[PDB]
Amino acid sequence: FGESWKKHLSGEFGKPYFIKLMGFVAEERKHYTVYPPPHQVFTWTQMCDIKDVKVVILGQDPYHGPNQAHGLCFSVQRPVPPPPSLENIYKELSTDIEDFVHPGHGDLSGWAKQGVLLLNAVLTVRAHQANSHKERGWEQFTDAVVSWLNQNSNGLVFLLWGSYAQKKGSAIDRKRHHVLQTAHPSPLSVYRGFFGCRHFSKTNELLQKSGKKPIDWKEL
Amino acid sequence: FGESWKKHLSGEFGKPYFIKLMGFVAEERKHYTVYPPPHQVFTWTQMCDIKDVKVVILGQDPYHGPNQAHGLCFSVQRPVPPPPSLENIYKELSTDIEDFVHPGHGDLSGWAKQGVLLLNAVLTVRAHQANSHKERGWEQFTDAVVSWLNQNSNGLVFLLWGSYAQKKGSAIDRKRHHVLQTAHPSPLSVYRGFFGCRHFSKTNELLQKSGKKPIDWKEL
């Protein structure tokens, strides 16, 4: 776990739902298999810092199969064949990056050092089961993280694609930041809008409205 | 209009929808009758100050009949017979205030000097017509006011009753403030929850968690 992340995240503990989270999910680790272990929950708070966060991309549900996911949202292990929606966001990357290189795998250890907050909303779910758990405390623990970054850190962006990400972080101001939303990256998302939009420039381009640490998509 | 309100509301003008608002609604005043005049839009920014705002109560739609409303939300003129939902919030006031006095009218010039932000969301609609207009700019002009008060002023409360008020101001923090929501004050609101809840103590009671300027409900 990264200590400088909890420079002011000490106001994450003392709430009536936190001990509901780290004990019962540990109790779910003492009976069942919730899929991501404790040494993969803390990857996003270890690999990147909090000093350079520039893109906020949420994540709805983890990957219930064994030996697939590693904590980051829309992410999977490298020997896993790559997931289709992450294979679907690659399609717009060719049409906007002229120098399109190919990842060839599913580990997202290349964009994580850029300034993207690849956060799953509920970090752990069970093995072989998608949405078994109730709101055991993974939601508001992140809700106290997302809207907290509206105070201290700066330079974010919200590509809150899909109605699950629209409810969590919509009302954050548009003077300090920029919020652009469209259809889901999955091809199971009949009402279109994602299918050709050129949002992926606006990681490189909306930072020209700020002037902060730059981005290259092609770190793969 | 109150000048000290616009101590820092000068960031309300320079957006692409503001001239869409004060010209076209004035154009709607140059063809049709939008019901509340310009000398009743500015009552909430005149009668109370911004230095003492403690309760945030939204308002969905104005009162389309002639000689009824005067700008504040859930409010109507004094010779008008009182509206039923404002007559419905009176029912819980008897069951919680032991010294229950009666207003006898519909002008809310008694609670406005307390610390309640009786704000309509869309301030003007047409005469004899409820929801004729499109989003001509009344919404985000208030959305840039409500979430702006999350920065400068302090001590608010959110009795965001009804799903129209839930979308606007939900995600404001619960460390600095307190958000309690229930069913609608109207008796047309089949799924119950409003019908006996004792929320009206928590204007007098949640300020004991803050310690600011006090409230008496009985100023009527």
């Binding site: - | 063809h31 049709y32 009758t33 002639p66 005469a127």
Partner: protein, 116 residues
């Protein structure tokens, strides 16, 4: 769009009338040589309305029917009175006894004769 006239702007001749009585909030004058135009502008507007050979079964308004000429351009203005000119129906009938005090009244209800 922007269908303007090649002659003098009759709508500006009506809008210049609209800034007088709406500013007559009891200003203390008698509008009887100015409200002749409310019969004179529209009969000038009627004098050119016979150009297209109209069908005389039109009990509706050309603001609903014929947006090509200056009749329907102007009937929608002073019919959409915003319950303000409708007071003059109440004012110059309940408080009307004198012949100038009906001159601003009886010429003008037939000036809204399709609007009646």
């Amino acid at each position: 769009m922007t269908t303007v006239v090649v002659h003098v702007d009759s709508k500006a001749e009506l809008t210049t009338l609209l800034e007088q009585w709406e500013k007559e909030h009891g200003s203390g004058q008698d509008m009887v040589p100015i409200l002749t135009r409310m019969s004179q502008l529209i009969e000038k507007e009627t004098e050119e309305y016979r150009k297209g050979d109209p069908d005389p079964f039109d009990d509706r308004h050309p603001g609903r029917a014929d947006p090509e000429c200056m009749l329907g351009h102007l009937l929608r203005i002073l019919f959409k009175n915003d319950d303000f000119m409708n007071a003059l129906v109440n004012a110059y009938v309940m408080t009307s006894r004198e012949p100038p005090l009906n001159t601003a009244a009886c010429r003008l209800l037939l000036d809204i004769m399709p609007g009646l």
